[PDB]
Amino acid sequence: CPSACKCTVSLYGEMVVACGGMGLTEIPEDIPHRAVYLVLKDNNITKITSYSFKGLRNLQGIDLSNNKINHISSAALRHLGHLDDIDLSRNELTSVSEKLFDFPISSAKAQGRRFFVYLANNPWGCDCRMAWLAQELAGGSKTFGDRHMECATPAALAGRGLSEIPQTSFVCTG
Template structure:
């Protein structure tokens, strides 16, 4: 009972001191709270409606909580100068892009949570530096990335290969395909690698010169490639050709008929002429 009473008396004092330390830190960015527990600085900016990561986070921060915000992009400058960072919680934002160099300088990073965001793809380079450092120092490094609308194409083939072999750095929990449609709802680690393909890009990124293709098919340099006409145009042209042919046939029939009529008329006139001459002789 004495121990319980002592704890009950001490707890309010500790809580007051804790709040005082948090509020008294002039380096803590608004509207975040900063707490130093056993020499490890934690900065919490959770649920503050942030659209980007605050630029003035203390450089000695070890644990950074940024969940439940509206952050959309992680740039190469988002964590600049935070070399002591051990963990970053970015879950439940609206992140749709992470720069390949966003975590490059975070050599002591141990855990990153990018779950429940709007990520459709992720470059293998994003966490390469952190993984390399962790292996060299023989410590853990892990990334949580569940519940994102992943586009399971060639851009995520590298991740599928790691998940299939039992990755020690990437969580396979709820890594579900959203696109393409024929893979929607399937777990990425269960998708055959030969189905993770990318559609050909059109426009400036297309590596195929269409004129070269046509010249290959048609060897004559001056010849023009035959392009398929639109269906409506082809139908109208066909109808015109049929009508023109029909009209021509009718004209030919009429001309032939007139010629035949003239021929028989002339022939009949020649036959009647001798008969009239005989009648005149008899008279």
């Protein structure tokens, strides 16, 4: 168990790794392979990389709410086939890639279960890189929650809900 965390096994035999509110600037090393719930809420994390969850393929819940995350590698979740919930709410993300969620979505579908992504309260940049999520939300996706999903930029779209903006308003210049 990492020194900044508490690792406890539940009555159901599931290991919770609780590292909330510890001032962490990075994901801790040596989280045990048996980790099922990883709580990293209320820290100072800025980046999720391709290797942030290396060796943590049993994770069912990841709580990264209320950090300072401004980028997540599109490869970060590519081996997380048991993920039920990921919380990236209250961070500094301006975009997320569609490819980021492919594996947990596919795995959840194959396993007959729900995989939920909670992205509330990020400063979304509503250019052509976020049209995909805008449209999934507009369509009624069961994967991506639509609470507090609003554009920070560009100026014309500031304050508008992603799911209420037409596709042709999501524009990229050079």
